[PDB]
Amino acid sequence: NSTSIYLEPTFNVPSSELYETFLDKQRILAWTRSAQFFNSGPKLETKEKFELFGGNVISELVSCEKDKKLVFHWKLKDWSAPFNSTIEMTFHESQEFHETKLQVKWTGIPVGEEDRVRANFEEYYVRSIKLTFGFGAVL
Amino acid sequence: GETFEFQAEITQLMSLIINTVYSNKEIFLRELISNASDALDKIRYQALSDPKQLETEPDLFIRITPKPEEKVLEIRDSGIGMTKAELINNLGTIAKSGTKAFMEALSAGADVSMIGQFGVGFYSLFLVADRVQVISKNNEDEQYIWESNAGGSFTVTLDEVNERIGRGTVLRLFLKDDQLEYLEEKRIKEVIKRHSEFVAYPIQLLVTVQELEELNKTKPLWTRNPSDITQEEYNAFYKSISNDWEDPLYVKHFSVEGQLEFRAILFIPKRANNIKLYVRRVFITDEAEDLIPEWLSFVKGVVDSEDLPLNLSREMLQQNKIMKVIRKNIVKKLIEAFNEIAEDSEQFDKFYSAFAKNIKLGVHEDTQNRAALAKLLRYNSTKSVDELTSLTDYVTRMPEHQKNIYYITGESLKAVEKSPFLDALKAKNFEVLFLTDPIDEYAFTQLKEFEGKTLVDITKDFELEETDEEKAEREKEIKEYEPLTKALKDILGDQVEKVVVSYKLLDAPAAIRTGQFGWSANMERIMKAQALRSKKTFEISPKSPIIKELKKRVDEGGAQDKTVKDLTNLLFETALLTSGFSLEEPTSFASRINRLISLGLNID
Amino acid sequence: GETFEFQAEITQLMSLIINTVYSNKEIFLRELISNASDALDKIRYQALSDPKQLETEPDLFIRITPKPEEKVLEIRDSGIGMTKAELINNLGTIAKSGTKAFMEALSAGADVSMIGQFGVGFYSLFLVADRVQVISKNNEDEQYIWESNAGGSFTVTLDEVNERIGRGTVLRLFLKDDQLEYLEEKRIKEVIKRHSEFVAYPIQLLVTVQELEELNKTKPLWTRNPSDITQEEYNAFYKSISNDWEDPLYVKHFSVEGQLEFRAILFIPKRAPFNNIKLYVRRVFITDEAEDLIPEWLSFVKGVVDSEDLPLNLSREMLQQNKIMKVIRKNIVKKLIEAFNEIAEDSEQFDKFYSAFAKNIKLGVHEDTQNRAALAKLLRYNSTKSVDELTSLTDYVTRMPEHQKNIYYITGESLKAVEKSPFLDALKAKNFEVLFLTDPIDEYAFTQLKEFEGKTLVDITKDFELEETDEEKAEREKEIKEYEPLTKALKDILGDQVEKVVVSYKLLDAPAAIRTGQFGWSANMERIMKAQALRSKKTFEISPKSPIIKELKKRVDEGGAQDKTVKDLTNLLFETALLTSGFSLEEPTSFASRINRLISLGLNID
Numbered sequence A: 001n002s003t004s005i006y007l008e009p010t011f012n013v014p015s016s017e018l019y020e021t022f023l024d025k026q027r028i029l030a031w032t033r034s035a036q037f038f039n040s041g042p043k044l045e046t047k048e049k050f051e052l053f054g055g056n057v058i059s060e061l062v063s064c065e066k067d068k069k070l071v072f073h074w075k076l077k078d079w080s081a082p083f084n085s086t087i088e089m090t091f092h093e094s095q096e097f098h099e100t101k102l103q104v105k106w107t108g109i110p111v112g113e114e115d116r117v118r119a120n121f122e123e124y125y126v127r128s129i130k131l132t133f134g135f136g137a138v139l
Numbered sequence B: 001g002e003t004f005e006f007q008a009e010i011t012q013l014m015s016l017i018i019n020t021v022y023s024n025k026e027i028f029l030r031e032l033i034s035n036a037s038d039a040l041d042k043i044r045y046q047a048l049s050d051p052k053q054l055e056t057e058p059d060l061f062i063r064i065t066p067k068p069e070e071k072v073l074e075i076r077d078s079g080i081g082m083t084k085a086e087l088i089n090n091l092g093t094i095a096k097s098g099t100k101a102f103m104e105a106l107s108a109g110a111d112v113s114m115i116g117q118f119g120v121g122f123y124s125l126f127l128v129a130d131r132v133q134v135i136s137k138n139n140e141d142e143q144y145i146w147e148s149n150a151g152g153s154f155t156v157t158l159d160e161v162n163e164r165i166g167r168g169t170v171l172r173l174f175l176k177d178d179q180l181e182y183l184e185e186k187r188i189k190e191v192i193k194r195h196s197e198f199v200a201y202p203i204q205l206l207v208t209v210q211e212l213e214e215l216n217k218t219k220p221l222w223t224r225n226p227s228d229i230t231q232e233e234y235n236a237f238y239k240s241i242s243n244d245w246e247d248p249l250y251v252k253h254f255s256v257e258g259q260l261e262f263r264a265i266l267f268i269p270k271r272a273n274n275i276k277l278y279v280r281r282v283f284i285t286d287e288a289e290d291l292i293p294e295w296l297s298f299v300k301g302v303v304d305s306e307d308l309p310l311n312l313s314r315e316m317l318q319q320n321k322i323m324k325v326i327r328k329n330i331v332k333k334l335i336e337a338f339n340e341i342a343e344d345s346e347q348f349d350k351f352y353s354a355f356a357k358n359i360k361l362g363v364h365e366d367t368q369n370r371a372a373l374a375k376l377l378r379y380n381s382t383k384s385v386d387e388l389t390s391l392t393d394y395v396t397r398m399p400e401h402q403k404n405i406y407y408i409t410g411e412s413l414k415a416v417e418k419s420p421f422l423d424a425l426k427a428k429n430f431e432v433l434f435l436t437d438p439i440d441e442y443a444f445t446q447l448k449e450f451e452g453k454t455l456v457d458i459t460k461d462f463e464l465e466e467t468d469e470e471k472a473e474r475e476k477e478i479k480e481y482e483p484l485t486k487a488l489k490d491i492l493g494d495q496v497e498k499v500v501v502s503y504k505l506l507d508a509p510a511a512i513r514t515g516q517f518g519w520s521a522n523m524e525r526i527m528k529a530q531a532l533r534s535k536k537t538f539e540i541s542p543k544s545p546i547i548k549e550l551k552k553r554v555d556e557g558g559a560q561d562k563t564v565k566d567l568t569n570l571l572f573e574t575a576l577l578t579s580g581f582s583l584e585e586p587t588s589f590a591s592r593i594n595r596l597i598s599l600g601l602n603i604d
Numbered sequence C: 001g002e003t004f005e006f007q008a009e010i011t012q013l014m015s016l017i018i019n020t021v022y023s024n025k026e027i028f029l030r031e032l033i034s035n036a037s038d039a040l041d042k043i044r045y046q047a048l049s050d051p052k053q054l055e056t057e058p059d060l061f062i063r064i065t066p067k068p069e070e071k072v073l074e075i076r077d078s079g080i081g082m083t084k085a086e087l088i089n090n091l092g093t094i095a096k097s098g099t100k101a102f103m104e105a106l107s108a109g110a111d112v113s114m115i116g117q118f119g120v121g122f123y124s125l126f127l128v129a130d131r132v133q134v135i136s137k138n139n140e141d142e143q144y145i146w147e148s149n150a151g152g153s154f155t156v157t158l159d160e161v162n163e164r165i166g167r168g169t170v171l172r173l174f175l176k177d178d179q180l181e182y183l184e185e186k187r188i189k190e191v192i193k194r195h196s197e198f199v200a201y202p203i204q205l206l207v208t209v210q211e212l213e214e215l216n217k218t219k220p221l222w223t224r225n226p227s228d229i230t231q232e233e234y235n236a237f238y239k240s241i242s243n244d245w246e247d248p249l250y251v252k253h254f255s256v257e258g259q260l261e262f263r264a265i266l267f268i269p270k271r272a273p274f275n276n277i278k279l280y281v282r283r284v285f286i287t288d289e290a291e292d293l294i295p296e297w298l299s300f301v302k303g304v305v306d307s308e309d310l311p312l313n314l315s316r317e318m319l320q321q322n323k324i325m326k327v328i329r330k331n332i333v334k335k336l337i338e339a340f341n342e343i344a345e346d347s348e349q350f351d352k353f354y355s356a357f358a359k360n361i362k363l364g365v366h367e368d369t370q371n372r373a374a375l376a377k378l379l380r381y382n383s384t385k386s387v388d389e390l391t392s393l394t395d396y397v398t399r400m401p402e403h404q405k406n407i408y409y410i411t412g413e414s415l416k417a418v419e420k421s422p423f424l425d426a427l428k429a430k431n432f433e434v435l436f437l438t439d440p441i442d443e444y445a446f447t448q449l450k451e452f453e454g455k456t457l458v459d460i461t462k463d464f465e466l467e468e469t470d471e472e473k474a475e476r477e478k479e480i481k482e483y484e485p486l487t488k489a490l491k492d493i494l495g496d497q498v499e500k501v502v503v504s505y506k507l508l509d510a511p512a513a514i515r516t517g518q519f520g521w522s523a524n525m526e527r528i529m530k531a532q533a534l535r536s537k538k539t540f541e542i543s544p545k546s547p548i549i550k551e552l553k554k555r556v557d558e559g560g561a562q563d564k565t566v567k568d569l570t571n572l573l574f575e576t577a578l579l580t581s582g583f584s585l586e587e588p589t590s591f592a593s594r595i596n597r598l599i600s601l602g603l604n605i606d
């Protein structure tokens, strides 16, 4: 069967720039170092598939709002055919502290891979962006 | 169906308990001392009800006699001893612990706390000895010899060739041909100072004329109340559990009772794992990193407990939820321990100057005591140049209109005391803190609030409240310098986000700020300097003669003039140095300086 | 005299193997899976001599069917099975291992390697279960039921109500109330992924529609021939031992067959993870927290190590201290040093490895000593003749002229700051290549190496002597004393900021420069020490042929040693040299104040 996890990292970057980080192909390749886009467009569109991390990570943007919502169909190449997950990103930019707490409601992951994709998210998605673009101190 | 009772293969169980239980082979001496300490507790428990039990041997001691010429390591004590039946039932049966049965037979409420509770520790001596010749002697029995060679059977013979001892047990161990390293003097003292250092009874060692040296001169202090222990006794206790020869700066001795009963004596050194675990007055392990946080791991001391589920090898403990309970009690006792140091002035200066990193790491890592550790921070400011002030005293000097805490980071104190960002806050009587260590910004980016006051970094862009009449006069001046601000943007290009007029610069001609997000001017300097491991805004001051001179240059048509580019580019890079930004291509910056020096020397 | 055999208290020994050993409670599944693995090895060893042993049940599997309705975790296998007599001696006697006795009865030249060698792993199931009903079935006996309550006796009854299984053993584990976490699908897969992931026989799990899912789909590769394994099979193996999403960069599969025989498949990831090496004994995960197994600077390497002759303890969670782990540490580094050499033979493959583990290789040169010279061959840096592509220390000495006896390098904060440093023109005139050090860990490696193939490593930022002829040395000494009144005048102005002012001919385009000295920290080293989260001397030099310094020579000739105008430019030139040499200004406000004065007079501001 499948399960779901909940991640809530905090970034020192407004929602106007953090939302473009997950869509700008020129900036996606920065914090990923490996990307395969199949469309000539500069920014990601709805129902657009792209492979990441040497083709092992397959993602597809399904729906997204203006700096508020980001929905992706995340799936690993090691997973089987019926297995497919969905990442739900919600922005909670707080002007009193000048930061953005991106609520990630990740569902559709297998029961045995709930800790695998979670341990790598804080390294390839959270720490990788905070180190390449400098969206917060890392320690 | 047919019911059968469980059995055990004696010839195979002996090899498992000896070889495949203990990781190290030096702990055999620790168990023999604990068995000797338990035997001394049995005869002492009978002494309070019958003083005649100590007439044979009045002194209670544990003697170790190494014999290199005979390859014999004798370990003698003066405990209760074992009778003829105890040498077969208690000592001859695996998993049979006579010490545990003695703890269950005594009256409820006894002060004795014995060590042996498993029944298989005695067989650990065979890891270094092939044959043993344990000799016992009790007050109610004769003297016998318990000889064994770790085989399938043992022999018990009446002692008629050795000396007549009064009371106690003499364990003669014939060490193996490859374990003769335990016959030296330092090796014996190394095992005692590591596992059985704080035994309540003196451990005597026969060293070469022959003399007896006590190896446990230092007595445990967790068995006494903190009210009757002097300061000098805490100094010798710290120099015995460690190697530093300086007295502890502060000592925290507490005792938790209730459902969990444990005592701990935590010490704070004078300069910058370390927490030892003792169960039944015996060292268990010191590799429990989950017991004490990493940022708080600068303190030393021991933790005494009696209800911990020790491993069969007694080298560690099982996974249990009590570790997290003790971890909570250690932190909460050290939090108030730092508060007692904060009550004093001269003692807290030595603590903060020696452990400034550890206090600030807890604000960055720990999220529960982040508010408590914020009150312990001490920094400099414009209103306090010599003495260090805290965050609590800072809000006391804040006026009624100031609603934020201002600070500034930098490489040194002399670079931030004359920073061009202070003239704006000093004119409004706003105190601004000084941060000099690289780890300061790592703590202020997590706290972000102290008693409701938002932490604002002045090196980044920010807005200050002002009157409506003054803002109406500033907005009409920005559009006057609007052709000048856009002219400097095309000259600098992509070096900065934008060029805007700033009124927070009184004397300085220009400066470079941050963009409210990401790494600041000092943070990026730290990230690019770690051996193991943003956007900037250029602003000018409209009240400086340099910027005012550049205003008339764009009016006469010098927006793209070549002579002015040698100055606005030089004025930009020199402002990067005063703000703390990295200077790219320092050779080009020095070449333009050398050209100005040549003009001052009347040479081309 | 009186001879007595050793005894064992049953009611007390049963507790010492439950609540004193096996510190972790989740390892009960690791033992029951391993117990089912050796049972499948016994029935398989009998198949080569009698194929009719598998006619009752041809399939060999380990099935786990949880039943949360009755709080029972069932584990079914198709092993050899136990007879009525085997349920009494092999299972009812402590420290009695029927698997260990089967290994001693094997024929000469056997290849089967069974796991069970102690005889107490079966009793580990009582950590989470109060009573167990072991249902066994052998081809040479009937189907019986072995029931126990972890007390002092057990009951063996003939099976008359359960399933009539063909061959194998069914273990009915009635889990405790406080240990019901092992009845869920997620918790069971965590134990298999951690301990019993690489079992040779398929492990079936009944997940809830009732369907089966094989947990050990990824078979181990250390048993197969390394020359027969493809590159894609190593990628799938890397995704199992580590949770990384990137494919491994390089794979080193070796096998030492000396006094200590062991296999090890070490992988090289594509990105730095900032243990990683797991230890396996007979297809069973033992531990992954071995300190002396792998060095600190080499911790980026991932993979597993499979051995057989290792001193396992009672819990099988650690190794005994028998001084045998150091030879494994030697062979791992010995093979990885050659593994890095094989990557160096390829141009593109080494670019991805060096750009990802640049600090890891240089860290070994700092602490490690036995392989310090071997790691120097892997160092790649830029230089004046290799500004575009990277060059190694071996290619550097090939380009060194016949009269050069030292390797010149320079440290700095960035590459653009050192490519135009005024310290390079001194060596460019002699056609000497100078390496570029841009990382904070670069100087830590050069301070420990200090020599490469007999060539002494010298930093050009520090004081050093460049060779000269007798015709030029005479011209320098005649000119030094000419600037001697000027050098002394520069000392009283700067004061204690510098130790001395010496006329240096190693400066061509710059008017002045500052060096730290001969010993101690360099200009960039002290800057890094003052910038670490967990955490000097200067020598002022001038160029005697520059128009600025020559103009200052006549300033002191007319009595301007203590002139007011010369003090502002000398401090300006001194603080300017701090920026080019890599120092930090004492106060940037005063440095900007002197610059703003030159800007004011440049704009005719009165």
Ligand SMILES: Nc1ncnc2c1ncn2[C@@H]1O[C@H](COP(=O)(O)OP(=O)(O)NP(=O)(O)O)[C@@H](O)[C@H]1O
Pocket: B031, B034, B035, B036, B039, B077, B079, B080, B081, B082, B090, B091, B096, B097, B098, B099, B100, B115, B116, B117, B118, B119, B120, B121, B122, B123, B168, B169
């Ligand atoms: N030196 C001694 N003098 C007198 N009695 C002893 C001595 N050593 C052992 N005994 C007795 O022998 C019994 C067996 O002890 P032992 O086999 O060492 O395990 P244990 O100490 O009782 N429990 P543990 O220490 O956790 O292994 C003890 O309970 C004592 O009654």
Ligand SMILES: Nc1ncnc2c1ncn2[C@@H]1O[C@H](COP(=O)(O)OP(=O)(O)NP(=O)(O)O)[C@@H](O)[C@H]1O
Pocket: C034, C035, C036, C039, C077, C079, C080, C081, C082, C090, C091, C096, C097, C098, C099, C100, C115, C116, C117, C118, C119, C120, C121, C122, C123, C168, C169
């Ligand atoms: N699932 C099983 N099927 C058949 N026989 C089994 C099974 N489990 C255990 N046995 C038998 O029972 C004996 C007792 O094994 P056990 O008590 O588990 O320790 P061990 O596996 O033999 N040695 P160790 O794994 O180091 O504890 C084994 O040697 C087998 O002969």
Ligand SMILES: [Mg+2]
Pocket: B031, B034, B035, B116, B119, B120, B121, B122
């Ligand atoms: Mg004992």
Ligand SMILES: [Mg+2]
Pocket: C031, C034, C035, C116, C119, C120, C121, C122
């Ligand atoms: Mg077993």
